[PDB]
Amino acid sequence: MQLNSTEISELIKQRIAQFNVVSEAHNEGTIVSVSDGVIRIHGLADCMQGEMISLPGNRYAIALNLERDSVGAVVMGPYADLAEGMKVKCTGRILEVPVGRGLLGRVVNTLGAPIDGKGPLDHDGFSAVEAIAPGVIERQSVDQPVQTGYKAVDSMIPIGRGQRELIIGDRQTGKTALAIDAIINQRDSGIKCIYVAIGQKASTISNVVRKLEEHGALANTIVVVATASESAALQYLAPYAGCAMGEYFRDRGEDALIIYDDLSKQAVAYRQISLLLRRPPGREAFPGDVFYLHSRLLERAARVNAEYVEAFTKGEVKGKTGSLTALPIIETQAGDVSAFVPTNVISITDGQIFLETNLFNAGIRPAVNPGISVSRVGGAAQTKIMKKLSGGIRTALAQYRELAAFSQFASDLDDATRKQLDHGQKVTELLKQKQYAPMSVAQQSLVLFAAERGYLADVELSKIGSFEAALLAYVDRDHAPLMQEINQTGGYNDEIEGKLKGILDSFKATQSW
Amino acid sequence: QLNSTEISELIKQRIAQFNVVSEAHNEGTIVSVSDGVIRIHGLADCMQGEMISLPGNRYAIALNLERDSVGAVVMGPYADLAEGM
Amino acid sequence: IIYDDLSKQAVAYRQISLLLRRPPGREAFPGDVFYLHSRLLERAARVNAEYVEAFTKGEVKGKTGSLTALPIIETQAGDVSAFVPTNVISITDGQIFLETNLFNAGIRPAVNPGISVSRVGGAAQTKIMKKLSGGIRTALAQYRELAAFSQFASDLDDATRKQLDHGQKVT
Amino acid sequence: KVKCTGRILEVPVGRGLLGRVVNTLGAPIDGKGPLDHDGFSAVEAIAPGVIERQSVDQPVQTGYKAVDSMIPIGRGQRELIIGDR
Amino acid sequence: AQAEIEAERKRAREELRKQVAILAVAGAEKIIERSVDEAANSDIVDKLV
Amino acid sequence: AQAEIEAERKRAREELRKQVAILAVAGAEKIIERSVDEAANSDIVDKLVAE
Amino acid sequence: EFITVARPYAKAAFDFAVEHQSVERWQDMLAFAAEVTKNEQMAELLSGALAPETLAESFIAVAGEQLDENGQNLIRVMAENGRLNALPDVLEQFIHLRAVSEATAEVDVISAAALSEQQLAKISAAMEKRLSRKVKLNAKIDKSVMAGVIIRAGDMVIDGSVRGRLERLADVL
Amino acid sequence: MATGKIVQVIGAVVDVEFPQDAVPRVYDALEVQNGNERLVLEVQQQLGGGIVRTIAMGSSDGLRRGLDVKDLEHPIEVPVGKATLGRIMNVLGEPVDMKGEIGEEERWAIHRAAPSYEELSNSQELLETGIKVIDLMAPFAKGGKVGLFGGAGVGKTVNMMELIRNIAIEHSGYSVFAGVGERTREGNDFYHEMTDSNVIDKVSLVYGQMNEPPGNRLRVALTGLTMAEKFRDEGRDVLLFVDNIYRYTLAGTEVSALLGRMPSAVGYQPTLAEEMGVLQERITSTKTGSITSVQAVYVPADDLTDPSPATTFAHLDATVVLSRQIASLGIYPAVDPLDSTSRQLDPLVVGQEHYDTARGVQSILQRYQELKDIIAILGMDELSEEDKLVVARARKIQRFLSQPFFVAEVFTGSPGKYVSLKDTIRGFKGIMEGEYDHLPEQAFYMVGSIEEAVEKAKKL
Amino acid sequence: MATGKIVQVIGAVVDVEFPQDAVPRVYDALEVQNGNERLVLEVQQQLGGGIVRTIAMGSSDGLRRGLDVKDLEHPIEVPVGKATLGRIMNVLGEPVDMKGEIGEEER
Ligand SMILES: Nc1ncnc2c1ncn2[C@@H]1O[C@H](COP(=O)(O)OP(=O)(O)OP(=O)(O)O)[C@@H](O)[C@H]1O
Ligand SMILES: Nc1ncnc2c1ncn2[C@@H]1O[C@H](COP(=O)(O)OP(=O)(O)O)[C@@H](O)[C@H]1O
Ligand SMILES: [Mg+2]
Ligand SMILES: [Mg+2]
């Protein structure tokens, strides 16, 4: 399909024919200094703070300091080949990014340029990266479920559309796995997905993209990439580009979910860019406004009322309420939640899914820690059946954990607690599942029903993964008409209670694990 | 390379005649105001610890007699003050 | 060669570097404090016979030269995480840690084994000492493992009581 | 006025230094008269390179049961002695 | 497929050596807007291949 | 597999096009350098001074 | 580089020169001082740790063609602050300040060859409409342009060179 | 022709002034005559007009203001290829082994961009080290990274020597060793161990010694990376040994403090994580070849929490944890089997047999660590008869995963042994299942394959 | 009549230069046309030579150097009294509520 070199010739001829011969005035400055990624520019009297300055080589710098006689800008890309005396041009643009459905399902960097190798984007218009969040009166309460597909999170820690949930934990405890499984689970909801990776090594992004397209979720998500080796300016500004790309959907009355991978690395990149500009430091050398770094980001994750979207879209949409859901990830060191950036982001978000390392190493995966993890939006964002089934699980598990801590010193122990310390040990063995296996509300619901109404009390040998798999296969064969009702309505009734009793009774009596 | 509180019109006054000490050593002019600390130009007669009288009825305490300016602190509300007083 | 208080050469160099208005690092020490001690301590070396024979232009043959360095460092309340202790602990081939809790209890010289390392090991021992030292290392290691139970002794089994009271006799 | 010698700090060296008390410039301070040195050597010098070394396989004895048995020192080794005051 | 595309590219390269003869004076006569001097290909032999 | 082969076809086509782009524009440069006249430079400048 | 230290002195000198109707004399006085600042021997003296007063007198002496108002005061004030090496910039700022009040612009033009003096007068009259100043063109004969012209009016630039269009086309591809 | 002139010298930091036409760009290499010696400088910053701020690679003594400086218009570039095998070089690619010139044929700049995520090759081919405990408890694939964490004196350097030997005369692939912050004694011992063991002809050695200016120590990692990348482009599966990352971060701290940058959380440089990323992001497998890597990491004062070990953790795929307690009990290699981990240790990539054997070993050792204090208090004759068997099997496992190294012979005299992964799994899987409950414990200490255990017991 | 010029912009900190005699006082409020929206600056320091250092009560992006700044002769002033009951306001006394306008009698 390439022998037709007339195709090459016609491409080149079209590019020549449509070259424009006239020239236009532009404002120009000279590079006076360059070091560690920062350049000083002389000239550009009309440069404006936050503007994009175009360097020779089709790359940009962001004018951060407008000093009295020079402009201090940070290069977005490889700076080492710049040299004093080169000339730069001022674009009339405050930092932009492309937005729209057209980049939905494509891999791009912080500037919206496609690193995917599949041609140019088809955006509609551009959005300012550093925007402002909706006001107090333009917002709405969050009472719509978003399902992460994980029994532990969807039952104990419900997430709502417009909520901000912190995924916090030590290194290598399944944070990225939980995040991209929450993405994959949105294959077929109305929620669009966005994954921003900050400081990730390129092999992790390659694996993430392969898994996203393998499980069929790539067509429904935007991937924004600032790898571990790219200039700190690109890593510091990546989550704002991702937030603008998701806020495009928010403002049109649709639902988006955005995952910031290692905000605790955006803070490090901002610390670097700040110290290289000689700005005064604060508690751990992080600049003074590091709180105002994450705050003005996570306050853009909001659910917005119908009047706001109606007025923004100039009346083209009437009944919809838009929303953007944020799942920032934070890495702690030896689980000291009380560190500086973790205790800031915990003061910003509306909950945290604390992932405990000693549960993760013990094979409990996902290693969510009950008690210390909460959702302050809570049951308002939980479908009715899940809310009914899950009410006890969290406190039952926390008290099971403390009782099983006591147990090690107390052999020959009361036969009443002997049963609590076994039901807890079965529920904690039930709420752990394979990695890329998201589970619908019905499959979680009837499993939690089996566990809560005592049907597990005779499987007290821990052959209980096979029990779950066989129960799901059985229900998927016979009673698919009930799973459809549960998945469509999420409702719960005494009639559905009886139907589930019937399913469990018929399963116990007639099948094997 | 930084400035040291020498400014255009004070340089112009020195340009008019270098020996401005032909003027009174008894007085000067406020040059900057920040968080209650004040910088004054002139006051060749000032001595450390001296009470300097400001417009209104306020005093400042001369803490520093530097090469060309006096650094003092304001004993009262300072936001009412301005350059050139 | 013994250098007594390299941690005072470091202070004199900090003074010189702070009076020259050089950029201060951690604890106001200059950036090149490591490059101060390393190019000192790396001068302690064993040298092969050909270097000696070439340097002296004959007049010596077969012999190998040597220079052994024993730098001394003072720590403030036993903290090793300081700047100069970190550099010198990173440079040298091993450490002899002298601790005050052992010195007070009468263990003198108060060398703390296990926490103290020599990376030359037996290569720098007579074969009799190399033979005999391994059982001392293992005895003190088992003693350090059991020492938590010392103030609960007379509760213990006799088979571990023997190890516990053997480590005390080695100490 | 200051004149720049092209020289670098050198220090006396030799066998006559053996048994003397000397300050960092090589001058005797014990009062037992001048040095019987063997020329001078540069204070700042370059250590022997990689290929000029040899493996440390000779003991230097401390006479302490605690050190020679469990923290051996060899001729050519560098051993830090670290502790509190 | 690799062996297909290899020889496909190798066939293309020889024809683009003809097409460059047009495209170079095309880029010239787009720029000045002056009709280019044709027969100025006295130089073009080194640019041809 | 066919998608990956298509990606490599894209790569090879773009590379060939970029090589011909470099050489074509260099030839245009040398043409414009050799073939020029004052009656053309004055026309270019008279188009510039128009705005 | 000391643009920032020269701004106050240039502004004071200019704002004084218009109180005494002698901008034109001040400009050449500062030009003389800016030249004396460059000599290899004087540049050795200015680096040494002389007292500001005697170092100022050692600078007045080599320039007697100066007003009482200008040299014997400005040079002394700059010496007290140790700013004399800034003189080459105090000149340029001064010139610039003048061109601002006199509503003038030193437009620069660059070309492969001389312009016809009809082209150049049209350029003058057209820039005076683009801007709001009396322009003062000065041309440069740079061969790399090959054809067309570059018009630089400070930080604004209009590029009509065939090389600029060529290397823009090279990036259209 | 030389066009630059020195205008300052402050320690290792040199300022050079050039014509404003010809200012060298960042990371360019300048050259000057420090007397009769030739000294190269690396441009760190283009501060001010015409001036350039640089770090001297050699020592800065003897420099004087006004010397002429000649700017090489390319970064520091080193020889690469076959010609560098068996040689020792400094950061500038000059031979420091007195065997004459390198015989170079091509030179590569040490600064280059990392492979893009599209060029990476997803791979899961496990390496087979000769070491039982590392093969079992912490497998790692081609292109992966392994960190040997531990204190001082635990065996990181000799473990890397053993790996170099085993992957140079069992699998015959090339290897590169970048001794950043090397100790000259240890570097000479390494050279003589590799020359005595015949493997020297398949290892390329770069040394930046501790008595050299900070940036000279800093750029050595990139020099070794560039040699490994040249071997990768030839299609090889190279293996890169970094002798200590902690001293690379210390060299970065020093050079950042010399340039007067504002320091960071613990006095570390601000660019810490970007230097670590620019180092570790070039070490990857690609569609043509691969660079695998193992890195020694010294943990200062025994905490995994300070910026250096904390920032290197983000890049490793496997972590081996060495302990001086286990080493003092006379077991080598002193790997802690419970705390060492790998991302590739799951049934899907190692197979269910390997995964089950590893998890069973860890479970047995954990149960023994539990029983140890009941044994301490109540004596052993009180344990239940299945616990008296867990004890013996854990005690035999704890012996069997020690091993004699070929390079440790000079410490012990006994010969080394290379153990295939099949024999390792067979041995541990046999021990846990009781096939060897009749052998003494000392039949497993410092043996190779289980056949040596049975033969030693037969001899014992 | 505006009289000042923006001379620096560094983050949320803005320096503006006034005639030597018209320098604002310490807590006075200035304002600027940041594109279409007006922006209020609260003075924080008086530096030498008529320069005044202020902090922006709003987004700092989009500000050029040399923009004209207008000196309000009073600090930030807000509405007060019964008129403000049941409303929502921001720092500048502007309704961020959308019920229209505050009919205050006094500020
Ligand atoms: N539910 C699960 N079941 C089994 N294995 C899992 C599960 N979740 C994660 N893992 C495994 O744990 C390893 C670490 O996972 P992941 O990278 O998501 O954690 P992380 O905290 O993002 O890592 P880091 O933050 O250190 O880069 C992965 O290799 C993955 O295979
Ligand atoms: N497998 C082993 N056999 C014998 N001795 C060993 C072994 N491993 C380490 N050692 C001893 O440890 C000392 C230093 O080990 P090394 O590898 O330098 O530790 P580090 O990781 O601190 O560099 C050596 O002198 C050697 O005697
Ligand atoms: Mg992760
Ligand atoms: Mg080591």
Interface test with G, best of B2, B4, B6 (most G CBs within 10 A): B6
Question: Is H328 touching ligand 2 by the criterion CB < 6 Å?
Answer: no
For residue C83, how far is its CA from the centre of ligand 4 (angstroms)?
A: 19
| Alpha-carbon span H431 to H397, nearest angstrom | 7
CA angle H254, H257, H259 (to 5 degrees): 115
- Supply the DSSP symbol for H4: E
Which residue's alpha carbon is nearest to atom 10 within ligand 2?
Answer: H155
Which residue's alpha carbon is nearest to atom 16 within ligand 2?
Answer: H155
Residue B4 contacts I, CB cutoff 8 Å? no
Segment (H or E) for A128: strand A126-128
User: Which ligand 1 atom is nearest residue A171's CA?
Assistant: 26
In order of their start, the domains of chain H are 1-75 (2.40.10.170), 76-344 (3.40.50.300), 345-460 (1.10.1140.10)
Which residue's alpha carbon is nearest to atom 27 within ligand 2?
Answer: C121
Q: Which of H247, H303, H252 is nearest to H274 (CA)?
A: H252
- From D64, D68, D80, residue closest to C89, measured CB to CB: D80
| Alpha-carbon span C57 to C51, nearest angstrom | 10
The answer to whether H460 and H443 are in contact (CB under 8 A) is yes
CA distances, A447 to each of A451, A470, I65 (Å) = 6, 11, 65
Integer Rg of chain C from CA: 22
Beta-carbon contacts of residue A56 (< 8 Å; ≥ 6 apart)? A86, A87, A88
> In chain I, what is the straight-line distance between the N-terminal and C-terminal CA atoms, in Å?
22
Q: How many CB atoms lie within 10 A of CB D73?
A: 24
| Alpha-carbon span C12 to C20, nearest angstrom | 13
| Alpha-carbon span G47 to H431, nearest angstrom | 83
- From I15, I63, I96, residue closest to A49, measured CB to CB: I63
User: This structure's resolution (angstroms)?
Assistant: 3.1
- Nearest Cα of chain D lies from the Cα of C155 at a distance, in angstroms, of 31
Polymer length in residues for chain F: 51
Helix axes A175-184, A202-214, angle to 10 degrees: 30
With CB atoms and an 8 Å threshold, state whether A202 touches H44.
no
For residue G30, how far is its CA from the centre of ligand 2 (angstroms)?
A: 74
Domain A383-513 CATH class label = mainly alpha
Q: Where are the beta strands (DSSP E) in chain I?
A: 4-10, 13-17, 29-34, 37-46, 51-56, 68-71
Beta bridge partners of B61: B51, B73
- Nearest Cα of chain G lies from the Cα of E32 at a distance, in angstroms, of 7
Homologous superfamily, domain A94-382: P-loop containing nucleotide triphosphate hydrolases (3.40.50.300)
| Alpha-carbon span H372 to C146, nearest angstrom | 11
Q: Looking at H5, H70, H107, H183, which residue is catalytic?
A: H183
Residue F9 contacts A, CB cutoff 8 Å? yes
Interface test with G, best of A23, A58, A67, A71 (most G CBs within 10 A): A23
| Alpha-carbon span H376 to C142, nearest angstrom | 12
| Alpha-carbon span A229 to A475, nearest angstrom | 49
With CB atoms and an 8 Å threshold, state whether E32 touches G147.
yes
With CB atoms and an 8 Å threshold, state whether F28 touches E31.
yes
3-class secondary-structure state, position C146: helix
Integer Rg of chain I from CA: 15
Which residue's alpha carbon is nearest to atom 23 within ligand 1?
Answer: A172
3-class secondary-structure state, position B3: coil
| Alpha-carbon span G139 to C163, nearest angstrom | 98
Q: Which residue of B has its CA nearest to I47?
A: B32
Beta-carbon contacts of residue I20 (< 8 Å; ≥ 6 apart)? B8, B9, B83, B84, I49, I50
| Alpha-carbon span G73 to G88, nearest angstrom | 17
Helix axes C83-91, C34-41, angle to 10 degrees: 30
Polymer length in residues for chain I: 107
Q: Where are the alpha helices (DSSP H) in H379-420?
A: 387-400, 409-412
Q: Which of H443, H185, A455, H309 is nearest to C41 (CA)?
A: H185
| Alpha-carbon span A182 to A179, nearest angstrom | 5
A320: Cα within 13 Å, side-chain hemisphere: 18
Neighboring chain H residues of C43 at a CB cutoff of 8 Å: 211
Which residue's alpha carbon is nearest to atom 15 within ligand 1?
Answer: A174
**Residue type at D50 in one-letter notation:** V
Domain edges within chain B: 1-85
| Alpha-carbon span A404 to A413, nearest angstrom | 11
The answer to whether I76 and I86 are in contact (CB under 8 A) is no
Residue list, ligand 1 pocket, CB within 6 Å: A 171-177, 331, 365-366, 434-435; H 343
Helix axes A340-348, A263-275, angle to 10 degrees: 120
Question: Is H268 touching ligand 2 by the criterion CB < 6 Å?
Answer: no
Which pair of tokens denotes residue G6? 């020269």
Which residue's alpha carbon is nearest to atom 13 within ligand 2?
Answer: C119
Topology (CATH) of A24-93: Elongation Factor Tu (Ef-tu); domain 3 (2.40.30)
Pairing relationship of beta strands B28-34 and B37-42 according to DSSP bridges: antiparallel
CATH of domain G3-101: 1.10.520.20
Burial A143-162 (b: 16+ CB within 10 A, else e): ebbbbbbbbbbbbbbbbbbb
With CB atoms and an 8 Å threshold, state whether E16 touches A8.
yes
| Alpha-carbon span A201 to B82, nearest angstrom | 56
CA angle H317, H321, H326 (to 5 degrees): 160
| Alpha-carbon span A452 to A327, nearest angstrom | 29
The answer to whether H441 and H395 are in contact (CB under 8 A) is yes
Q: Which of G98, G127, G119 is nearest to G31 (CA)?
A: G98
Q: Where are the beta strands (DSSP E) in H278-375?
A: 290-298, 318-321, 341-342
Active-site residue H87, yes or no? Answer: no
| Alpha-carbon span C40 to D46, nearest angstrom | 9
CA distances, A382 to each of A148, H165, H357 (Å) = 12, 59, 42
Which residue's alpha carbon is nearest to atom 1 within ligand 2?
Answer: H332
**Residue type at A237 in one-letter notation:** L
- From G5, G15, G69, residue closest to B3, measured CB to CB: G5
Strand order through the sheet with A351-355: A329-332, A166-170, A351-355, A374-375
Integer Rg of chain F from CA: 20
- Supply the DSSP symbol for G159: E
Q: How many CB atoms lie within 10 A of CB H2?
A: 13
Pairing relationship of beta strands I4-10 and I68-71 according to DSSP bridges: antiparallel
Q: Where are the beta strands (DSSP E) in D1-85?
A: 10-12, 40-42, 79-83
Neighboring chain G residues of F17 at a CB cutoff of 8 Å: 173
Within its chain, how far is the Cα of A491 from the centroid?
Answer: 28
- Supply the DSSP symbol for G51: -
| Alpha-carbon span A445 to A469, nearest angstrom | 14
With CB atoms and an 8 Å threshold, state whether C26 touches H247.
no
Find out whether the peptide bond into H333 is cis, omega within 30 degrees of 0: yes
Q: Where are the beta strands (DSSP E) in A299-402?
A: 303-304, 322-326, 329-332, 351-355, 374-375
Neighboring chain I residues of B8 at a CB cutoff of 8 Å: 20, 49
The answer to whether A464 and A182 are in contact (CB under 8 A) is no
Please provide residue I95's backbone torsions phi and psi, each rounded to the nearest 5 degrees.
-65, 115
For residue H150, how far is its CA from the centre of ligand 2 (angstroms)?
A: 12
The answer to whether B41 and B69 are in contact (CB under 8 A) is yes
Pairing relationship of beta strands C70-74 and C2-3 according to DSSP bridges: parallel
Topology (CATH) of B1-85: Elongation Factor Tu (Ef-tu); domain 3 (2.40.30)
- Supply the DSSP symbol for A300: T
Task: State which approach was used to obtain the coordinates.
Answer: cryo-EM
| Alpha-carbon span D78 to D73, nearest angstrom | 8
Pairing relationship of beta strands H175-182 and H203-209 according to DSSP bridges: parallel
- From A8, A13, A21, residue closest to E26, measured CB to CB: A13
Which pair of tokens denotes residue A212? 């996203």
The answer to whether C133 and C122 are in contact (CB under 8 A) is yes
| Alpha-carbon span D49 to H37, nearest angstrom | 16
The answer to whether C37 and D80 are in contact (CB under 8 A) is no
| Alpha-carbon span G125 to G109, nearest angstrom | 14
The answer to whether H418 and H447 are in contact (CB under 8 A) is no
Neighbour-count burial of A443, counting CB atoms closer than 10 A to its CB (0-12 exposed, 13-18 middle, 19+ buried)? buried
Q: Looking at C119, C137, C144, C161, which residue is catalytic?
A: C119
Question: Is H155 touching ligand 2 by the criterion CB < 6 Å?
Answer: yes
The answer to whether F22 and A132 are in contact (CB under 8 A) is no
| Alpha-carbon span C37 to C35, nearest angstrom | 6
A255: Cα within 13 Å, side-chain hemisphere: 16
Q: Which of residues 4-33 of F touch E (CB under 8 A)?
A: 5, 8-9, 12, 16, 20, 23-28, 30-32
3-class secondary-structure state, position H78: strand
Active-site residue C43, yes or no? Answer: no
With CB atoms and an 8 Å threshold, state whether H214 touches C32.
yes
For residue A377, how far is its CA from the centre of ligand 1 (angstroms)?
A: 27
Polymer length in residues for chain D: 85
User: What is the DSSP track for H117-184?
Assistant: TTTB-----B---S-HHHHHH---BTT-EEEEEE-SSSSHHHHHHHHHHHHHHTS---EEEEEEEE-H
**Residue type at A138 in one-letter notation:** E
Neighbour-count burial of B34, counting CB atoms closer than 10 A to its CB (0-12 exposed, 13-18 middle, 19+ buried)? middle
For residue A272, how far is its CA from the centre of ligand 1 (angstroms)?
A: 28
> Any idea which residue has 């200019």 for tokens?
G14
- In the 3-class helix/strand/coil scheme, how is A34-64 assigned residue by residue? EECCEEEEEECCCCECCEEEEECCCEEEEEE
Segment (H or E) for A496: helix A494-510
Ligand nearest to the CA of H408: 2
Neighbouring chains to G with at least 3 Cβ pairs closer than 8 Å: A, B, E, F
| Alpha-carbon span C14 to D85, nearest angstrom | 21
Touching status, chains E and H (3+ beta-carbon pairs under 8 Å) = no
Q: Where are the beta strands (DSSP E) in D28-69?
A: 40-42
Pairing relationship of beta strands C65-66 and H107-109 according to DSSP bridges: unpaired
> In chain B, what is the straight-line distance between the N-terminal and C-terminal CA atoms, in Å?
28
